[PDB]
Amino acid sequence: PYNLAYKYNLEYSVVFNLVLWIMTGLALAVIITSYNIWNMDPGYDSIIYRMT
Amino acid sequence: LCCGPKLAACGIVLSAWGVIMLIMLGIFFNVHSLIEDVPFTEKDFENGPQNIYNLYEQVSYNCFIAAGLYLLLGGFSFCQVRLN
Amino acid sequence: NNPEYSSFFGVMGASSAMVFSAMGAAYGTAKSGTGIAAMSVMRPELIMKSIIPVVMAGIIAIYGLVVAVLIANSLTDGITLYRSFLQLGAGLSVGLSGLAAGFAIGIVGDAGVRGTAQQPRLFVGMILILIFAEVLGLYGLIVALILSTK
Amino acid sequence: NNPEYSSFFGVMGASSAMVFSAMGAAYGTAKSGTGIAAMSVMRPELIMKSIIPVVMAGIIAIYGLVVAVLIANSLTDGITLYRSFLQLGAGLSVGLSGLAAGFAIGIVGDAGVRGTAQQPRLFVGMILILIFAEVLGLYGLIVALILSTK
Amino acid sequence: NNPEYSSFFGVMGASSAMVFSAMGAAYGTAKSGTGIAAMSVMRPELIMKSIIPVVMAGIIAIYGLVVAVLIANSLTDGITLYRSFLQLGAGLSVGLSGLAAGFAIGIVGDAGVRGTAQQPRLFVGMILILIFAEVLGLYGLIVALILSTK
Amino acid sequence: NNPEYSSFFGVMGASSAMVFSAMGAAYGTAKSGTGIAAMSVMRPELIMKSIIPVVMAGIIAIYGLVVAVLIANSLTDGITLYRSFLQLGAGLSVGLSGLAAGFAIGIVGDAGVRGTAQQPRLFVGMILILIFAEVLGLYGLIVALILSTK
Amino acid sequence: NNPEYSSFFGVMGASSAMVFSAMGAAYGTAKSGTGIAAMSVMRPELIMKSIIPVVMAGIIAIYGLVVAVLIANSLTDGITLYRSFLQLGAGLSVGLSGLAAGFAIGIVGDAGVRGTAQQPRLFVGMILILIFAEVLGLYGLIVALILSTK
Amino acid sequence: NNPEYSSFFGVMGASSAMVFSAMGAAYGTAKSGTGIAAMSVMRPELIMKSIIPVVMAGIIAIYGLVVAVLIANSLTDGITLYRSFLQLGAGLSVGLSGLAAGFAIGIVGDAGVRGTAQQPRLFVGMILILIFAEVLGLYGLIVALILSTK
Amino acid sequence: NNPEYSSFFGVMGASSAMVFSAMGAAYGTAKSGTGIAAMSVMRPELIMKSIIPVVMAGIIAIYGLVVAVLIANSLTDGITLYRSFLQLGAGLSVGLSGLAAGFAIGIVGDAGVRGTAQQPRLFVGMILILIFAEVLGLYGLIVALILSTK
Amino acid sequence: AHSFALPVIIFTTFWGLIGIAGPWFVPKGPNRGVIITMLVATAVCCYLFWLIAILAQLNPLFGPQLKNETIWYVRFLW
Amino acid sequence: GFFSPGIWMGLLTTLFMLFIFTYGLHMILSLKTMDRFDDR
Amino acid sequence: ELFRSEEMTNQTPPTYNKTNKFTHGFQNIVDAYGIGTYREINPAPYTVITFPFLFAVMFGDFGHGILMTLFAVWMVLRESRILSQKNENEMFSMVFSGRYIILLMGLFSIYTGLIYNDCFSKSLNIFGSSWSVRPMFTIGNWTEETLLGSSVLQLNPAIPGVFGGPYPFGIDPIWNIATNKLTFLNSFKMKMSVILGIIHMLFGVSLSLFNHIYFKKPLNIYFGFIPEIIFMSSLFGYLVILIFYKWTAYDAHSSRNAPSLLIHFINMFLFSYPESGNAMLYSGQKGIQCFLIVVAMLCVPWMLLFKPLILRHQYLRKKFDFGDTMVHQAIHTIEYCLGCISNTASYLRLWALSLAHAQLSEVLWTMVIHIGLHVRSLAGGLGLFFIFAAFATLTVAILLIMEGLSAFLHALRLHWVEFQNKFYTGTGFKFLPFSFEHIRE
């Protein structure tokens, strides 16, 4: 219809800026936390030397 | 052939289970000519309910054929265990 | 009158639940299986009991299925956005919580299975530890159920 | 009058409260479990005392569960955004604070349990240290509750 | 009537299902082959039985093949957009879930075959654990089938 | 007349203060607890003196609780934004400063506690040094209190 | 009527197909050559037969060559966009799937050839495993072909 | 007439001045305390003298406190931006400068304390080098203060 | 009607064809030369018949040169964009495919020459393997030739 | 068509007699205590589960969503 | 639009000070204590 | 009269439970968790039914119930030949030793599968399916809907005046062919899991009363049992009542703004009573919800600190580590209250696995055996043979083994964690008399 615009969010830059960096920081926090847990060091001692 | 009685014994169990399931399934298709409701109907479906009954009859026949093969399988596997 | 592509977020929810849950369960299984393979060489008689970490870990994938389906059951075109975010949050909640639980189960399973062969008295302690790790996956489900139905 | 997308913030809060606190408890439990296995093989008589770090870890996850539910039960479509922001902050406050508590609980549990194996007098000091980590988790809960009801 | 680019999401789905599942199967196969090659030195009699982990990987790849075809056959030019997103969700769900399964298959297969070489009684335990991982991949298929048909 | 979404920054402040302070106290606690477990295994008579590092870490956490609450009780819906930036500054100032203090407490605690057992005359020096770390945490609180009411 | 740039996605498909498939074959070739060189010192006999993993790698590259040509032949200026996206999907599907297959061929061939030098009975097992990886590559081709003509 | 957000840059200056200086002093203290703990075991008579590196680290923190407060007391609502960036510059100027000085104090102090125990004639040299480090932090303060009124 | 952003895509094709192919040939040359130098210590009589991996590397560079020239000769001002994307695809296709071949040439050359030194029977095998890598590079040229004239 | 009352009567009597009268007709052997425990526990567990299944289907809020071919098939089947 | 003069200027200054924080924290994290003490 | 250990003749005696060929296996899976306190209430007589029942709920599939039952029967029928032999494979020995446990699991799996009305994802229509009368559907303003139907579903309305009536036994078969099975039956399983879990938990608590009576600990019932059972009842039994209430209180006539039980449950705990937005289940509910939560909170002091206070009173009246006793009792209360919340949710395992099994079965059916059917006669018959064999193989490999194992373990885990921990406390020693048992060895 008449090549009308779809109303591309007034104040878009605000929602956009907020959501982008909020989800990026939170996503990274999860990635880093997951990394640290993924590679948890059990000590590789006590019984591990014998089981290996 | 012997093939090992452990594997012939498995065939007997599969064959017996199959014959039971295939006969019962074929009956269900023949009676409710249904819950499964998957006889591969035509897309060009006309106002002919009798066409659905005929499809199920075909499915039922196929079920008894498969059972026949399991009956033959059970026979062969049975003699293997007895000879082994 | 609803926003366009409002299902986009809800669809990611249903998928994210299954995807992260599979990641968690896969990690738990992989670590538990490694401990079992090393352990059972010395005491094969424990190979049956030692499976528990793996069996319990499977619950995470189940939780993913449960939520992923629960969300999928509520996906339509005319979604008011609000409900879509709720579905996305529920999907992530159970998925990432199941991921955390998967890590917990795997790490303790490896140590538990190896320790049990060294000391069978560890069995009771191993079970208790595994439970708490599983509870974490349960908590994920609880939030997803409350949120996805709000 | 309500800005669409507003619910996104609060919804991420409800999830974050559970997800981050779950990772904390997952670390705490997993790290303690390894230390427990080491102790128990050396001496199983303490197996029912070295479990405490794990119970504490679970309580942290509960802190997050409580907030996640409070936020989820506080979501609406006609959200005023202000409350949505408070919900996001509240969820993160308890989630990330519990996350820090989870690491604190795990590290000291492993060290304390392994030490206790050699020195039974270490038990009391271990508990006191564990108490500080549980308190660290609670502080997050307190702030999150203040914000979510503000 | 719908937005241009509406088909893009569905196309990514069909590709995602196949590619991620192949990645998982390839990983599982590579790790299994490595352990088997070494295992053959101790016990060549197990060369035939030890193939199973590799078959498990293969099935993961099929899961992906099935969904990728279903999406490709279902995707049209005049797509409803809503359905396009579901196809992407289904594609990612099965693909990434199969990918996780793939790692579990590889790690468990390698550790299992190596442990089996030392102790043949572990063979049955290896197979059981592998069954759980293959089922975890199937979990992905189930959700994908629900989404792609909704 | 007041800008929209103005509350966001102040809310992040309240949460940041608590989270970063908990991170600091958590690190300091974990590092001290490790040193305590390693130290007091040989000299349990010091177990009730080596706890202090941990208490000071807890003070870092309180600093954060005091500001996080002070900020939360200062928030409303119609915030002039100016006030929010002030709240964000106060939140970060105490939070990140406490975090730095946490590292100082942790590193000095571990080194001091183990050293103290080797040389009991070190105890007083350890406390004095840890006192500077608590002062570093307080400086952050001082600025945060100045900003939060500005 | 379609965007003048709509042809971009298709040609990226044709390129991606060839580039990723060649990368897979190149990796598999490099890994096999390394293992073969070491094996060849141990014993001449197997040099001839040990080439096979490299041939399989080559087939992966052909898989990609076939799709890249099919896309290039079908790609036009007045493209339907829909078809272009399909070509991008087909390109990525075969390319990335072949890439995954290339790693499987590489790792399995290397381990297989090195093992076979010690146990000639492994040769048959090695081929069977490599067969599954070639089949995984074919799967990528199948989907790409379906998408290319769809 | 005031560009909105004008207050945002200023308050970050106060934050940076305190946070970065605290980080520097915290590191400086941590290194000094570690060196003191290692040294003091063998030569406890040097404990009192060895504290100096820690005090200077503390002074670095004070410079930051001075600027952070000076900026905080200089904030208003109708900030003309020009003033805001001046305050941000002053904050960063003392922050990074104090941060760098804290590192120099920590690293040098650690070596100095250890060296002094081995050779007391180095004590004066330790102090001289460390004074320079503090003078660098002072520099940061001096310019940061000058800029605050320009 | 020609879009002014097209002469860039085109020329980047010609550049990519040369640059990536030179990178591949350079890598293959660097690795082959290193292996040759080490080989020459024991078997100097093989020096001349060990250059082949380097010649092959050069052929990869030519593959790129030829396409880069063909595109460069085809570049004009009034480009219909379609042609530009074909030039970009053709450039990347041959360049990146040659790059992949360069790694295969390099790794196989190094391992092959070092092996040949001890097992002269490896030489035919080294050549067969390296022939496959050159064929992989040619595949890139084939697609580029198809695209550049389409 | 069905009523709810009759199912309840028939299955409550069935499981009731088992859990109520069953223990009256038990051997005097060493397993008497075990047999009675099983009889009652079984009747309670089984009855409860069924009772839930039937009650959950009363006063339904919505019916099923059936496919068009399925709807047709049923029209001419039942 | 995606960005405003306000938002952007904020991000530009934020990154510079974020890099400073990253630098400081980096060296703080890469900070170890002693394995053992020298002597009695 | 509860089963307890046998009397022994001032040191801790061993725990002796007399078992036989049937009950021995059940006692062992109890002992695997721990040996009960001397004269503790033996959970095994209730495990015999409780555990297989919970399994059947998790494994409620008629067709697999048959397979599972037949396996157990085979083992028993060959008992004499398998037992009087060597069985070096511990996996076969293990399932053999549990053959009587499995037998029951099969028998209950059949019972539950029939109520679930799922036999390999197939329903069992007894010609009693009267959910709706399609002829009357068309009367209700549905004329030639099968024209648009070609592209749509159309949901069958409630309360059209011509539909209704419960299915005599189990879930009406009609839902097995619906596209929304996954909501109608999913809700049932969720609510059922809660109902069964909470009721079972209350039983576990009730048992603790008999034990506290046996050991003459008035304090453990005046400050323990009573506030503990009230606490759990007031929170979780209330929920159970409301679930049944809704099913019988509201019809489709009130489907719009029909109360949501989950939201009222949360609002209950929080004393959240909005003026509007949520309809109440019944008049006066607000007063009841508030009362019950207050009571639950008032239950805490009793179990929390009143016991150590009276012990301190009696101690000083007679004149005992008061501090440690207060801490121990506080821990009990904390774990009890938080456990009640977590334990109730734990029983979501029943739903979670039941759902998974049905979904794995459905996909195995749909993506395998469906392919065995074809419009071509001979090709269909021959293919169905080979396809079924694959279907049979996967059916066992995935469901009969693996999921059966998951259901076994999770049902057992519920037994150990939620049930036993309400009454089965403490430890004892295993009774190891001198006897000539090792005849076969």
TrEMBL record, chain B:
One of its GO terms (molecular function) is RNA endonuclease activity. Its main location: membrane. It is a multi-pass membrane protein. GO terms for cellular component: membrane. The keyword Transport does not apply. GO terms for biological process: endosomal lumen acidification; proton transmembrane transport; receptor-mediated endocytosis; receptor-mediated endocytosis of virus by host cell. The chain crosses the membrane at residues 8-29, 59-83. It is found in: Membrane. InterPro entries: Ribonucl_Kappa, RNase_K. Keywords: Membrane, Transmembrane, Transmembrane helix. It comes from the Eukaryota. Belongs to the RNase K family. This is Ribonuclease K. It comes from Rattus norvegicus (Rat). The gene is Rnasek.
